[PDB]
Each structure stands twice: as structure tokens, then as C-alpha cells.
Write a protein that binds this ligand. Structure first.
Ligand SMILES: *[C@@H](C)[C@H]1/C(=C/c2[nH]c(/C=C3N=C(/C=C4\NC(=O)C(C=C)=C4C)C(C)=C\3CCC(=O)O)c(CCC(=O)O)c2C)NC(=O)[C@@H]1C
Ligand SMILES: *[C@@H](C)[C@H]1/C(=C/c2[nH]c(/C=C3N=C(/C=C4\NC(=O)C(C=C)=C4C)C(C)=C\3CCC(=O)O)c(CCC(=O)O)c2C)NC(=O)[C@@H]1C
Lengths: 533, 42, 477
């Protein structure tokens, strides 16, 4: 289950609340809706089904291109967008599509249609029969036929179209070469370079790198913007600001573009014999939902372009996103979007390399520290692991540490007092004298009566047992300590930041598996050493 | 074997979020076949 | 006045005045003229839009960002792909006929050159990320599918700079070449230098008659056609290809980070008859090469780190074993000094007692080697060599093919640690004068006749670390 699967119900409920607020004619309440709607509980299956159908079978497209859906065997039209006639300069249910374009273009379309498992005419460059207007035709297959997306192209000499494609691809190659030469072992430098390269390539006003955490919430880790804009670097926001369905879609359409959020969507008309509404999952012209369009309008961004960052985890994993914003309407041609996809693949490869190297370095460091601690223990008393230079404060990342041995209490850093720790010990023995140790992200959630007394200094605790009355403790304070962004009912980044600092109010950062394994290993070593005495 | 991308759809079945779906020559031979310009001579 | 392959054309023009200064002898026939002559303005040979594009390319700083240009011949109206580069005298333009004349199909192919590369690289992304052989095999299959050649191979270069064939895909009726080693002189240093600056080499027909390039008689030296893509092959390599049976060839470079970049190897393609592939597929391959280089570098770094972890673990176990028992116990249990490094055998000399493991000399022979070492290498802490003959060991350096390389670490003055490697040919297997792969394989086994594989820096460091720990332990004793 986890949050990835638990978040679907929450997303559906937020969607239903937004729809009801829209129907009743009232504004949407963000903070109240987030507080009321919390993970868990249940929901009828019909709500999930309706939510998914609404997201994937919306029935609307953006008004910067046309869409026509045709039957595979007959080439007869089974659906079209309401703006098709105006753009083609002219359709009906049953009309033959080959009659809408010139004869050579219809031959090329037939060739593209008859291919098997791969085709080298996708997209095709076609002309309209009545006017001779050039279009990029992009084809994909749905459970009832073939959908053609028609994107207008600039009228010019073909040599110039080829030149534009060439220039875009060469810029992408140069950017990848610049990535090659960075000195490794520094993810922050990698992101700082990629953001600038993408901004230079695409030309948007703001470019940001978003990273997703194990808790599914997002962080802005790099930024490149126009001078007169405010910075968003350092921001954290909840996990429900990007639903799970859009994340799933990002693993198939690696680039998403929204040209104008204020533009009026265009309805798609379809043959009345089709049982369901036409699927628009693979289409590039799909329109965004009202929630996100309103969020964009409030923020002040009119055009948007998002690209998935995918790493290897056999199975692939979504690490984050690259997000671009513009203060006015903006559209980019198809070759440039494929250049951006190429650069994102290079970035993903480098990122995966860096992550694995960092893991190895951490393992090495932990092993060395453990060996030094054991050597120190053998040449000294039991208290030789808290009084020397290396100490249990270096085994894992923590705010404080403590050693309780034969009634003696040795603290380091931010740790409870000798009176409070006694109470913690009584609570552990009364409730948790059935294990070798434990780890908790928040003492309040665990159920420690004195959690409020400790305050924000001590929120998370890892305890390792040595014997019936000797313990090792590691302590962490609350998350807000390490989070600094220099900046309630309206959907806006500030509302998101305030809503984030309401679920981590009495929580620390989670304990990773590597840190717990290191703690357990040192625990076994010390257990044997003290048992031998 | 290179191929065209296939698109999937999320559905809710039996309490589960499931995803549903909807060459003997080389690439050079296909390129030669599909980019033939003879029809343009008519 | 060099030579170029006949499948294209070449014109060299002054940068400042656009006046032609040199050209290939086949230029007039290709451009449809048969005017072209010294001092003629190049723009007059092409249409107006072609001249505009050419001027734009000429006025750019990074001229490599406007390549390839699409132009049309003024007389006949046929399309050409032009590739421009700079030299000391002016600008060299390589003109190649385009096999597709319809603009719509031209644009479609230009877009496919990107889509195909993306779809190919998505298959490298999906690898687990811990195996170099699997990566090489996947790249071989992808390149073969894209280009369709008869044979595709991966060549890896060594520290000695000799080559090995590590992966290959071919027809069923051709003889395999996987496992072949050949000398380092089969690829001169100039070729390796050029494979970094210009990452592709193509030869359409080795038997084709070259075409002379004429130049202005006012120039003080011949033009530098080294960077041109139409340059003709050498006699040595042309004859080599003819003997081997290869008419067409395509070679691409593999680049990694060096210490400045390093040429790791090559991807080499062979066809039994003449072949010239269209531009979209060439660029689809050229884009995949960069992703291949990235992933290869990642794999090398990870393997290095895992090796370090392994050596440390083994050293720790050996030190524990030393603490538990006498030093002899180091060479009695399953972990032993043979697992510290890659070797054929090992030996421990301790107070005149001999402990051999695996393939090692005899006790009398070991005494002779110790005598030689003290006579000539007493003032040292140890050493390593890949051939006792070259080192000069007089006492029957001919210990056989079994003992050729030796690494020695001193302990105090009489206790020694030895690691032994046999001759290289032990680890080389291939199923298989006139320049031919068999001749190259036989010539390789004449420089490694009694030589072992070289001792690496990391293995030397591991041996030094173990030596230091043992020396401290014996200091305590
Ligand atoms: C309303 C139902 C909830 C919600 C829905 C929602 N969100 C997206 C997609 C995105 N929202 C993003 C979030 C942010 N944008 C920012 O810049 C910041 C912070 C600075 C936030 C919080 C982003 C980014 C995306 C993805 C990019 C994209 O353009 O797709 C969607 C889907 C959009 C679509 O394309 O259909 C939906 C339905 N957002 C909310 O705020 C609430 C909780
Ligand atoms: C004759 C002087 C020596 C020599 C010279 C030479 N070699 C190259 C380039 C290549 N030769 C290659 C060698 C091999 N090709 C194979 O497939 C195998 C084994 C199966 C071998 C040994 C290869 C590969 C290259 C690089 C690729 C390329 O096509 O360039 C050159 C440069 C020629 C040019 O392109 O101008 C020269 C001068 N080759 C010999 O084998 C002998 C000893």
C-alpha cells in the first residue's frame, strides 16, 4: 500500500470537493479541504472510477491544434474536434479522411497507417487540400482506431524547417557534452548546470528542478529565473499538489505542454455508436483540469512545460521533474521537444550514476567509523565511545546521542535531561520490553506522555538495547529546523508551504534503512563485547 | 528490437489500481521501402 | 593535393571573399556544369536561399552548429547536403548528393533522426547497470539493426594499446572474430588522434579509384584535408580491407573521461559489398554513441569502487588470521595471499621454510631467485615484473611458460611474499605474409611470447598495504 496507493482516495476526494465547490458557485477552500481530507478511511469504488474516467476521458483539448479519430480499415472519420473546420479551411461522421489533404499527402498517410510495430513516417508533414497549409501529423492508436493530432507549422522554405531541427539537436548535443566534463560526486552542481542548459535551450522565464521524497512530497532544489521574479528555491509542498494519476502519465508522455491556461477548451464530437468517451491519454492536445488551471492563474504563470526525470530502480522510477513557466502564452515546435527529451535521458543517466556512487561512499564511511569505535572500546572502558573524538554521534545523522550504562548517563549534543530520560526508560520498559530496540519519527505519535515536555528539541528517537538496563539513544529535532524558504484559502505556493508545515509540526526526518542497519550491527558487536566483559 | 511506444490506462478492478493495454526486416529496409518517390512521378 | 572518395565532392573557398581556391576533379560533373574555376564566386553555383544559408553558416563562430546545410544546385536543381569546416586558408565544403528529393520526406527524415536515437537510448536506460559485457552486446545489436551491415564489432584498447574484439554480431555464414588480439601498430597514432576530433570514419568502396584535388598554385603548402569526411583511405588499410574481404566500412569512437578525454575503443562495421547509408540513420547512430560512452564511464567507476571494497575485506580477514595463529597460518586456510590479487600462484618464505600455493617455482629455484634478488635487489622493499627474462634473472629465467611474471614483497630480510603469473597466451583463445587477421593474431603472439599480464597500480597498492601491516606485526615480535 504505502502512500503511493493510499493517495488515490485522497486525490479523488479532493477532486470531488473541487467539483462540488464549482457547482455551488463558491470558491475552493484549500487549507480546510486538506485538513478535513486525510489519508486512511475508505471511499466507494464508484468515486475512484469516476475520477479516473474524468481525468483520462475528459473530452476537451487545447485550442492550438486539431484532433481527428478515424477507423483503421475504412479511413472513415469517427470523431473530431469542433475547431477542425476552421483550421483546415473547410467533415462529418463517415467522411473519408484522405479527401481532406492533397493526393501525395494522402498516399503518405496511407503508408503511415499500414505499417506494423514501427513506422518511419511518424510525424508526417502534410498539406491541406483547400488551402495548402502545412501541418505536423502525429498518430497514435486507441482501442477503437487511430487518433491524428494536427499541429500547425510555420509557413516557410523547407530548408529553414530542416535548419531549425538541426540547430535544436546540435544545442542538445553541446549541452550533453558540457555535462560530460563536470567533476563527479556533486549532485547539486549537476542540477545547477542542467537548469541553466534547459533555460538556454527553451527560453522560458523560469526553470526549476523538483525532487520527490520518500514521503512523496516535493522540493525545489534548483532554479533559474528572470531577475524581476521572486525565487522559489527551498520550497516544500504537500504530496497532494501533484496527484498520482498525473505522475503515472508522466512515465509515458515524458513531455507535457500547456500553451495558455486562460484559453477556452474545445469540445470533441464523436460518433454516437461508441460506447464510451474517446480516450485522450496519449494525445498531446489534452487539456488540463480546472484545479491546475486555477492554480496556474493564481500563481501568475500562463504557459508551462514539464519533463520527467526517470532513473533505474529493470523497473524505472520517477525521481522528479523539470518545470518551466512563462508569464505569457508560449508554444514550441516538435523537434525542440524531442531535443529536450534527449537531454533529459542524458541527465537521468548521470543522476543514477551519482546516486550509486554516493551509496558506496556512505557504506565505506560507516564501516570505518564502526571499526574505530570497536578498537577504541577494547582499549578503554565502556564509556570510551562517548568521551573520545569519534563517537556514536558519527555513526548516523542525528542531533544528539546518549549512553545509559549501569545507572550512569552520558549525553552528547541535544539530548533529554537525566530526569526525563528516566521517564522515557520507564515508558519503554512498560510498553516495549519485548524487542532489542526501536525507532520512531515522532514521540507524540508513538504515545509517550512526556512528548510535549521535550518540545521541538527532541522529536525523533532511535533506541538500541545492550542489556536489561543499558541503552544507546540517538535523537533528532523537528523538521522545520532545517527548512528555510525566504517567502490560506487560495491555491498558491505560499498556501502550499503553510500547509506543509502542518503535517511535520511535531515530526523529525525519517530514519533510513542504512542507518538502522548500521545501528543494529554496532548493537550486536557491543552486545557480544559486554556479554564477554 | 526497436518499437513504437504503447499507451496504457488506469482502471479500478477488484480493489486494485491496474494498468490496461490497448518485424523481420531491418530499419534500413523499411527506410528504403517507405521513402520511395516513384508515386511522385505520376 | 590529396585524394577523396568518388561518392562525394569537395570545394575549398576563401572565407573573406567567397572565391573558390580549390576543388575535386569530379566537381563539375556532379554540380551539373558538365562555371567552376579559380576565383569564381561560390554563391553563383547555388540558388538564392542556398547563398543566404551559406553566408549565415560562414559568419558563425561555432561553425559546427550549422551542419548539415541543405542546398540546391543552380543549374540542375538537385539537393545536396553540405558539411563545412575551417582550415588555415579558408573553409572546406563537403557536398554529398541527397537520395530523397521530396521536401516533405526530407523533413520527415530529419525528425526521424531524433526519434530513432531516443527510442534506441531508452533501451540502454533499462539495463540493470552493473555489467559491461551486456551493455556492449546490446549496443552491437542496436547498431546492426539500425545500419544493417554484415558484421558489427566492439574493439577495446588496453594499456599496452593493443586491441581486443569483445562483442560481435554477424551473418550465420561468416567466420567469427570474437576473442581476437592484434598488435598496437595496426592502428597508427594519427588515426587514434583523429578519432577524438572527428568521431566517425566512413569508407564506401575501397576498390574505387580516388579523385585528385586541385588547388590554387599561389598557396605555399598543400591544403589540410585531414578533417574532411571524404578523404581517401591509405594503401596499407585499403589492401588490408581487400585481403580480409571488406568493401565498405564504418567506424565510430568511444570516449570516456581521462585525466582531457580517453579513447576506450571503437565500434567497427563491415559489409561484403559497397554501401552508403542515408544521413538520418548515420545521425541516429552518432547520437547513440554518446549515451553509450556515458554509461560505460559509470560502469567503470562502480567496478573500481567494488574492487576496493573487496580488497579491504580480504585484507581484514587475513590480518585476523595472522592475529589468531602464527604467520604460516596466513597460507593454510581458505582465505590466503592468493586472493589478495589476481595471480596463478603464490608463495611464503618464512625462516627458511617454504609454503607454496598453486603454480609456483621449486624450493631450489626459490633459493636461486632469492640469491639473485639479494645480489641485485637487496636495497629495496620489493618489486614486480611481468617477465623475468627482461628483468635479467640469470638463474634460468626459463622457468617455463608457467612462471613468467613475479611480484615480491620483503618482510624483514629473509621472509618473503611472492605472487606468480604465467605467460599471456594462457588466457587467449580464438578459433582461427599477407595482411590478414590471422597474420595479426600470429604477430601478436611474438611480443607476449614469455610475458605475463602487467601488474596494476591498485594491486601493487594492496600488496604494499599488506606488506606494511605484516612488517608492523613482525616489528612487534
Ligand atoms: C487540486 C485537485 C490539487 C491539485 C491537482 C493537480 N496538480 C497537477 C499538476 C501539477 N501541479 C503542480 C504543482 C505545483 N506547481 C508548482 O510550481 C508548485 C510549487 C511551486 C506546485 C505545488 C505541478 C508542477 C504539476 C505537474 C506539472 C504539469 O504541468 O502537469 C494536476 C495535473 C495537471 C495536468 O496537466 O492535467 C492536477 C489535477 N493541485 C493542488 O494544488 C491541489 C492539492
Ligand atoms: C599497415 C600500416 C598497418 C595498418 C595501418 C593502418 N590502420 C588504419 C586503420 C585501422 N586499421 C584497423 C585494424 C584492423 N581492422 C580490423 O578489423 C582488425 C582486426 C579484425 C584490425 C587489426 C582498424 C579497425 C582501423 C581503424 C578504422 C578505420 O577504418 O580507420 C589506418 C588508417 C587508415 C585510414 O582510414 O586512413 C592505417 C594507416 N593496418 C594494419 O593492419 C597494418 C599492420
Amino acid at each position: 500500500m504505502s502512500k503511493a496507493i493510499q493517495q488515490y482516495t485522497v486525490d479523488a476526494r479532493l477532486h470531488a470537493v473541487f467539483e462540488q465547490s464549482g457547482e455551488s458557485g463558491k470558491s475552493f477552500d484549500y487549507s480546510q479541504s486538506l485538513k478535513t481530507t486525510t489519508y486512511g478511511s475508505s471511499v466507494p469504488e464508484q468515486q475512484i472510477t469516476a475520477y479516473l474516467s474524468r481525468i483520462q476521458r475528459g473530452g476537451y483539448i487545447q485550442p492550438f491544434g486539431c484532433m481527428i479519430a478515424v477507423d483503421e480499415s475504412s479511413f472513415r472519420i469517427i470523431g473530431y474536434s469542433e475547431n477542425a473546420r476552421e483550421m483546415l479551411g473547410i467533415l462529418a461522421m463517415g467522411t473519408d479522411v484522405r479527401s481532406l489533404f492533397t493526393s501525395s499527402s494522402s498516399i503518405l498517410l496511407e503508408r503511415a497507417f499500414v505499417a506494423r510495430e514501427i513506422t518511419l513516417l511518424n510525424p508526417v508533414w502534410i498539406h491541406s487540400k483547400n488551402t495548402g497549409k502545412p501541418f505536423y501529423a502525429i498518430l497514435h492508436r486507441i482501442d477503437v482506431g487511430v487518433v491524428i493530432d494536427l499541429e500547425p507549422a510555420r509557413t516557410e522554405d523547407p530548408a529553414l524547417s530542416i535548419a531549425g531541427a538541426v540547430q535544436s539537436q546540435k544545442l542538445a548535443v553541446r549541452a550533453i557534452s558540457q555535462l560530460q566534463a563536470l567533476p563527479g560526486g556533486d549532485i547539486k552542481l549537476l542540477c545547477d548546470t542542467v537548469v541553466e542548459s534547459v533555460r538556454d535551450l527553451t527560453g522560458y522565464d523560469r526553470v526549476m528542478v523538483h525532487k520527490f521524497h520518500e514521503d512523496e512530497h516535493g522540493e525545489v532544489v534548483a532554479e533559474s529565473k528572470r531577475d524581476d521574479l521572486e525565487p522559489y528555491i527551498g520550497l516544500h509542498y504537500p504530496a497532494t499538489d501533484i496527484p498520482q494519476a498525473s505522475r503515472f502519465l508522466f512515465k509515458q508522455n515524458r513531455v507535457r505542454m500547456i500553451v495558455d491556461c486562460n484559453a477556452t477548451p474545445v469540445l470533441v464530437v464523436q460518433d454516437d455508436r461508441l460506447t464510451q468517451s474517446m480516450c485522450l491519454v496519449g494525445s498531446t492536445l489534452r487539456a488540463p483540469h480546472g484545479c491546475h488551471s486555477q492554480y496556474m492563474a493564481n500563481m501568475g504563470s500562463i504557459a508551462s512545460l514539464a519533463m520527467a526525470v526517470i532513473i533505474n530502480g529493470s523497473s524505472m522510477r520517477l525521481w522528479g521533474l523539470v518545470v518551466c513557466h512563462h508569464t505569457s502564452s508560449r508554444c514550441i515546435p516538435f523537434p525542440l521537444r524531442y531535443a529536450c527529451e534527449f537531454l533529459m535521458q542524458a541527465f537521468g543517466l548521470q543522476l543514477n550514476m551519482e546516486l550509486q556512487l554516493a551509496l558506496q561512499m556512505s557504506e565505506k564511511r560507516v564501516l570505518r567509523t564502526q571499526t574505530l569505535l570497536c578498537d577504541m572500546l577494547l582499549r578503554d572502558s565502556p564509556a570510551g565511545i562517548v568521551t573520545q573524538s569519534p563517537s556514536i554521534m558519527d555513526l548516523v545523522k542525528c542531533d544528539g546521542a546518549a549512553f545509559l550504562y549501569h545507572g550512569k548517563y552520558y549525553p552528547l549534543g541535544v539530548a533529554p535531561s537525566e530526569v526525563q530520560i528516566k521517564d522515557v526508560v520507564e515508558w519503554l520498559l512498560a510498553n516495549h520490553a519485548d524487542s532489542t530496540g526501536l525507532s520512531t519519527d515522532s514521540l507524540g505519535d508513538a504515545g509517550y506522555p512526556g512528548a510535549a515536555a521535550l518540545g521541538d528539541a527532541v522529536c525523533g528517537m532511535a533506541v538500541a538495547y545492550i542489556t536489561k538496563r543499558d541503552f544507546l539513544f540517538w535523537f533528532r529535532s523537528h523538521t522545520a529546523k532545517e527548512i528555510k524558504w525566504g517567502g490560506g484559502q487560495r491555491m498558491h505556493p505560499r498556501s502550499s508551504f503553510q500547509a506543509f508545515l502542518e503535517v511535520v509540526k511535531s515530526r523529525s526526518q525519517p530514519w533510513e534503512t542504512a542507518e538502522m542497519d548500521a545501528i543494529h550491527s554496532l548493537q550486536l558487536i557491543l552486545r557480544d563485547s559486554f556479554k564477554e566483559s | 528490437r526497436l518499437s513504437d511506444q504503447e499507451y496504457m490506462e488506469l482502471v479500478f478492478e477488484n480493489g486494485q489500481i491496474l494498468a490496461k493495454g490497448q518485424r523481420t526486416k531491418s530499419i534500413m529496409d523499411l527506410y528504403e521501402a517507405e521513402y520511395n518517390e516513384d508515386f511522385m512521378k505520376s
